[PDB]
Design a protein around this ligand. Structure first.
Ligand SMILES: [Mg+2]
Ligand SMILES: [Mg+2]
Ligand SMILES: [Mg+2]
Ligand SMILES: [Mg+2]
Ligand SMILES: [Mg+2]
Ligand SMILES: [Mg+2]
Ligand SMILES: [Mg+2]
Ligand SMILES: [Mg+2]
Ligand SMILES: [Mg+2]
Ligand SMILES: [Mg+2]
Ligand SMILES: [Mg+2]
Ligand SMILES: [Mg+2]
Ligand SMILES: [Mg+2]
Ligand SMILES: [Mg+2]
Ligand SMILES: [Mg+2]
Ligand SMILES: [Mg+2]
Ligand SMILES: [Mg+2]
Ligand SMILES: [Mg+2]
Ligand SMILES: [Mg+2]
Ligand SMILES: [Mg+2]
Ligand SMILES: [Mg+2]
Ligand SMILES: [Mg+2]
Ligand SMILES: [Mg+2]
Ligand SMILES: [Mg+2]
Ligand SMILES: [Mg+2]
Ligand SMILES: [Mg+2]
Ligand SMILES: [Mg+2]
Ligand SMILES: [Mg+2]
Ligand SMILES: [Mg+2]
Ligand SMILES: [Mg+2]
Ligand SMILES: [Mg+2]
Ligand SMILES: [Mg+2]
Ligand SMILES: [Mg+2]
Ligand SMILES: [Mg+2]
Ligand SMILES: [Mg+2]
Ligand SMILES: [Mg+2]
Ligand SMILES: [Mg+2]
Ligand SMILES: [Mg+2]
Lengths: 111, 23, 55, 212, 116, 122
RNA sequence: CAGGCUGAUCUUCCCCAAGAGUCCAUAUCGACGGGAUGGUUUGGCACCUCGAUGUCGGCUCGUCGCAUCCUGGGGCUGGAGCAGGUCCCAAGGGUUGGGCUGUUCGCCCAUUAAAGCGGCACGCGAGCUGGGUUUAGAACGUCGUGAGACAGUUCGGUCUCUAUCCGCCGCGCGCGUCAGAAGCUUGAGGAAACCUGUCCCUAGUACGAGAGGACCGGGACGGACGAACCUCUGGUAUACCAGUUGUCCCACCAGGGGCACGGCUGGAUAGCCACGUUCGGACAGGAUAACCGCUGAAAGCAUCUAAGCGGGAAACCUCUUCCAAGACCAGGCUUCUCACCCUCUAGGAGGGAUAAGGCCCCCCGCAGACCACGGGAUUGAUAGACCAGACCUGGAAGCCUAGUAAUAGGUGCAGGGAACUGGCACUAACGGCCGA
RNA sequence: CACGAAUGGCGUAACGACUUCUCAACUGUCUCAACCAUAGACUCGGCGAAAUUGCACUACGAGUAAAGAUGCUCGUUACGC
RNA sequence: AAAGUACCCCGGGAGGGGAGUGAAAGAGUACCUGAAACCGUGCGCUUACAAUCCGUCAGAGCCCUCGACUGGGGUG
């Protein structure tokens, strides 16, 4: 793969191995005018998009009676650390059926 | 207009002697 | 859209001259105590014996 | 006004000093030998001719080989000029000077010229950004067609520079400005921000920006 | 293999997959066939990727060759004769020869045959 | 991408219930509002008891949108809900509270009272 | 219907000022009367066409004029400031989306820096629509004894054509540029582009009784528009993976296949794309417009002018991007072959064979209607295969354990697989026609 | 202006490929287009029409003219196919 | 007047070239004479920077021809 010789610096090895289906607890660095903070996003991993720095992953909270869905680059400087707390098996690459579902029917089952 | 005026000023050419067959 | 005029004797010829044939441009093969000759794309098949030159 | 030939090596993304994503088009400007220096006495202008890219000696044409033999240089793939302003700038080049991508210095702006992708006879909609006619409400066989092309009995013709239909792309183009994110000295690559014209592996002339 | 860029020969996508099956199953029987040159070039990457399944001996590969071809004498002799023959050779099991133009349509013919 | 016509169900109380977009402000031929961009609106559904009637023209800011946007550091947000908050002449919402997560782009836009309210900023 | 002449009527300016403006005709309005421009309205006329010049509004595409709607530069003000009025200059760019009506026009709605006016057969139906008008059907009001009639309403009502020529948008072939070739170029002459907002500082300072509130110059973030590109997000996917319904077939069970819109459904790399992310509109210089001037006569004084010398706008030149020596004034800087042979009515002759190079064939492409352009051609990584990865799908077949069974779990991040990446000659890149 | 009582007046459940207005659902009708497949178009081999036609080695601008010119005037512009 | 081409060769045939028959195939059953439109082949002269009711008049050059030792043709 061409442009492997430029990727090596940005590729962090702090990320633990996870897959789609897994409940993952992503802490994020929020830089604002008052102060730097660690906000934390908490939800189920929907997908992974592959290919070095360019790969991303998508997490789904469901907060206060509305779905929110937030993507990050996996090798972002802003991503601080990722705690993988419940691993679960979903029989699928990319879980777009969770968009429609709401409720208790969107509950993923642990391995 | 412009085309109407200019045709009738071809009367004064010296060859025409102050009259030109309009129509 | 219909042709308004009959096309001239000069103009009909000058277009019509572009409609031509080129080719072949032969190369000297050998087979069976004789040369013949052949197009260069068929130069492998001529000596190997997939084509027949009696036609 | 410095310049360098190179190739487009494809795109990636790299994170900032202040943690933003900048999308970066990777070019590799290899070691270019200045072959001939055009001078204002004989030619009537000032320019520098740059050689780039490795080629086999047997591939080279004898007319072309003798020009490189005059320079004292191993023959190359591509060659092109940098036109530069005034007489003074050609004073600091010597034939056989092998310049590299280290010169540009992080946070510069460039022009980055290069021939575009051919789109291959696109008409009207793709080429010029026309609107087509409506897809429904009667419309008989006009859904992507140009429409009218002219007035009537005066002028009784189509004007020159009417926008129709024909072969699109392979234009020389230019990006303008386009910040250099990072000069990498080892490997010989420049991370330039944003898109640069052309296919992956096409010839590309990076020079410092005239507008800047 | 790589998909066809242009319109699919046969005049359909389903016809193309059936056509390449009937061309391949004929080629492994006889060992030689003659077609139009575009059909000959389309057959090469199809035919070689059955011979790689042949030389790798397993039941798994007997199933996946049988997803195409659809004939028991051919899938036998593909694994019996042809498979262990080209166990020696790495790739490139097939060649193309030019057989001059067809009479009615001037379609350029080509013979496609096993290397041996 | 709120556009013209369309239907947003309001985040803030105020008895609005639902609103239809008339104009996206801040330019001529300006197509798309999203999150930080204001709109002119019109109340469709409404509630019997409230300080807004049915069918009155009001300003509003977007807060959730179902299309996703880049933000910065390649980090996108995407909601299930096209929502908005009806505002006063300047900036303060006439609705006294706000429901659901607003975008964190609101802080940049200066609606500091809206992000001061609401369960979270995200 | 359209063109032509005419210009009563319309339309844009103008002469004279009775006046109104506290006073003061000319800051701004300007009666009565007079003189012209424009051809854009209603007309007059009957000159071209009735062996046919086919039709209002809308859509698509525009192109020019300035009598300027906005942005830019000025004078005067009954111009404090902000915001105006009025007149001169200026055509580079920009001049929104909806509601009602067949509409044009118009009334309204929410915005905008602004929602300009016109010509081009009231531009544009061998480009499109057919709602309006204007055939045949039919009812209503009216007039007629009646057949029927009405720029009175109402509902329904076939839109034909394979581009010869010029024209325009792209692309080659053939000679030419005083020998034949190749590489990089010069720029005569063109084209494309040219929009503008808010907000923070300067400063609550100038200015004003307060209310209000700046020029000039800084800095940040925009909208619409254009061009590149595919890293990201998003769409597409007809030889990719898995799920699944009905039915026939592979002897049958298991496991697969054909057909049903690609049978349907969930994802989907490359490619092409925008809804995506980058970038652009310049910064200077020169000669000017209206206007402001300096020094100064004729005319002892005066005066921007008569001689001369300046300032001065998005216009005009140049700068920026792209094409370009078929630019017949056919250019320049290099490098490479540079040499033979015969015939004749023997001279800017006709061949023949070549050299430096070109083309055809051959292997292809992210170049492509064809052609062309760009690579590769055995001293070879151009394409296929094979081997490895990337990436996509989501846990294959077989055997085994559990379950009375649908099914579940372990061998196993498995198996399968196209475009992206390297390695590897295994298959296919094997001899003719031009050319001083 | 100018409805009217069997050229019937005023209503009327059910019915209508009738005309009219509104509503929810859904949608490439649209904002604003994008991509894929097939059939023509395009290339090569074969066969092989047609309407039409005073001529031809058929530019453009401002004019003039039976009052809208490829052909007339004066310029400008244009290598052959 | 059939004397309608025996025979040989090219070819799958058709069709032809020799050979014959006849006064003549310049009469071959596609048949007396065989015009023009239209359709080719060869040979001169001209033409690829030029706006052509396609002619006309002036006219360079080139190519044939006659006649003494310049008259006519073709081209433009
Ligand atoms: Mg007049
Ligand atoms: Mg459309
Ligand atoms: Mg259609
Ligand atoms: Mg494809
Ligand atoms: Mg099928
Ligand atoms: Mg008339
Ligand atoms: Mg007319
Ligand atoms: Mg008449
Ligand atoms: Mg006629
Ligand atoms: Mg003016
Ligand atoms: Mg019209
Ligand atoms: Mg029509
Ligand atoms: Mg027309
Ligand atoms: Mg109608
Ligand atoms: Mg009566
Ligand atoms: Mg009907
Ligand atoms: Mg044509
Ligand atoms: Mg057509
Ligand atoms: Mg104050
Ligand atoms: Mg990619
Ligand atoms: Mg059976
Ligand atoms: Mg079974
Ligand atoms: Mg079947
Ligand atoms: Mg899908
Ligand atoms: Mg894709
Ligand atoms: Mg080549
Ligand atoms: Mg009665
Ligand atoms: Mg009665
Ligand atoms: Mg009655
Ligand atoms: Mg009745
Ligand atoms: Mg009634
Ligand atoms: Mg009925
Ligand atoms: Mg094609
Ligand atoms: Mg054909
Ligand atoms: Mg004219
Ligand atoms: Mg003439
Ligand atoms: Mg005869
Ligand atoms: Mg002339």
């Amino acid at each position: 793969n061409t442009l492997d010789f430029v990727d090596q610096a940005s590729l962090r090895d702090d990320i633990p191995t996870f897959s789609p289906g897994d409940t993952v607890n992503v802490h994020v660095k929020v830089i604002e005018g008052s102060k730097e903070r660690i906000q934390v996003f908490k939800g189920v991993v929907i997908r992974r998009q592959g290919g070095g720095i360019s790969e991303t992953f998508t997490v789904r909270k469901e907060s206060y009676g509305v779905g929110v869905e937030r993507t990050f680059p996996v090798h972002s400087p802003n991503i601080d650390h990722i705690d993988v707390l419940t691993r679960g098996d979903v029989r699928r690459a990319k879980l777009y059926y969770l968009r429609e579902l709401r409720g208790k029917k969107a509950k993923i089952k642990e391995k | 207009a412009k085309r109407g005026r200019k045709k009738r000023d071809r009367k004064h050419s010296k060859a025409n002697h102050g009259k030109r067959p309009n129509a | 859209a219909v042709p308004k005029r009959r096309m001239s004797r000069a103009n009909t010829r000058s277009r019509r001259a572009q409609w031509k044939a080129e080719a072949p441009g032969l190369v000297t093969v050998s087979v069976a105590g004789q040369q013949r000759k052949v197009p260069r794309r068929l130069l492998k098949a001529a000596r190997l014996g997939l084509v027949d030159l009696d036609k | 006004r410095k310049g360098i030939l190179g190739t487009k090596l494809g795109m990636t993304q790299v994170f900032d000093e202040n943690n933003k994503v900048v999308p970066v088009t990777v070019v590799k400007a290899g070691p270019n030998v200045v072959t001939r220096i055009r001078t204002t006495e004989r030619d009537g202008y000032s320019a520098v001719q740059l050689a780039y890219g490795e080629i086999s000696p047997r591939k080279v044409i004898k007319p072309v080989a003798g020009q490189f033999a005059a320079a004292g240089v191993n023959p190359r793939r591509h060659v092109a000029e940098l036109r530069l302003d005034d007489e003074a700038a050609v004073a600091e080049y010597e034939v056989g000077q092998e310049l590299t991508a280290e010169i540009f210095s992080d946070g510069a702006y460039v022009d980055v010229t290069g021939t575009s992708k051919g789109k291959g006879f696109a008409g009207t909609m793709k080429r010029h950004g026309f609107r087509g006619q409506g897809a429904a409400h009667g419309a008989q066989a006009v859904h992507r067609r140009p429409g009218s092309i002219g007035g009537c009995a005066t002028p009784g013709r189509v004007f020159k520079g009417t926008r129709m239909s024909g072969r699109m792309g392979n234009d020389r183009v230019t990006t303008q400005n386009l910040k250099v994110h990072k000069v990498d000295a080892e490997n010989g690559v420049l991370l330039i921000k944003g898109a640069i014209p052309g296919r992956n592996g096409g010839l590309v002339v990076v020079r410092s920006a005239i507008k800047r | 293999p790589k998909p066809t860029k242009g319109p699919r020969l046969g005049g359909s996508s389903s016809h193309q997959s059936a056509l390449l099956a009937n061309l391949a199953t004929s080629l492994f029987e006889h060992g030689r066939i003659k077609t139009t040159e575009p059909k000959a070039r389309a057959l090469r990457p199809y035919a070689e990727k059955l011979i790689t399944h042949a030389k790798k001996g397993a039941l798994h590969n007997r199933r996946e060759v049988m997803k195409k071809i659809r004939d028991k004498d051919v899938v036998h002799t593909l694994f019996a004769e042809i498979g262990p023959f080209y166990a020696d050779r790495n790739g490139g099991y097939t060649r193309i020869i030019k057989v001059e133009n067809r009479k009615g349509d001037n379609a350029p013919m080509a013979v496609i045959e096993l290397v041996r | 991408m709120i556009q013209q016509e369309s239907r947003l169900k309001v985040a803030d109380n105020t008895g609005a219930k639902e609103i239809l977009c008339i104009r996206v402000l801040g330019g001529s031929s300006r197509r798309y509002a999203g999150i930080g961009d204001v709109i002119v609106a019109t109340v469709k559904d409404a509630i019997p008891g409230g300080n807004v009637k049915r069918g009155d023209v009001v300003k509003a800011v977007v807060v959730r949108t179902v299309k996703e946007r880049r933000r910065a550091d390649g980090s996108y947000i995407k909601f299930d809900e096209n929502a908005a908050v009806i505002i006063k002449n300047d900036n303060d919402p006439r609705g006294t509270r706000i429901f659901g997560p607003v975008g964190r782009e609101l802080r940049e836009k200066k609606f500091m009272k809206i992000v001061s309210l609401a369960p979270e900023v995200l």
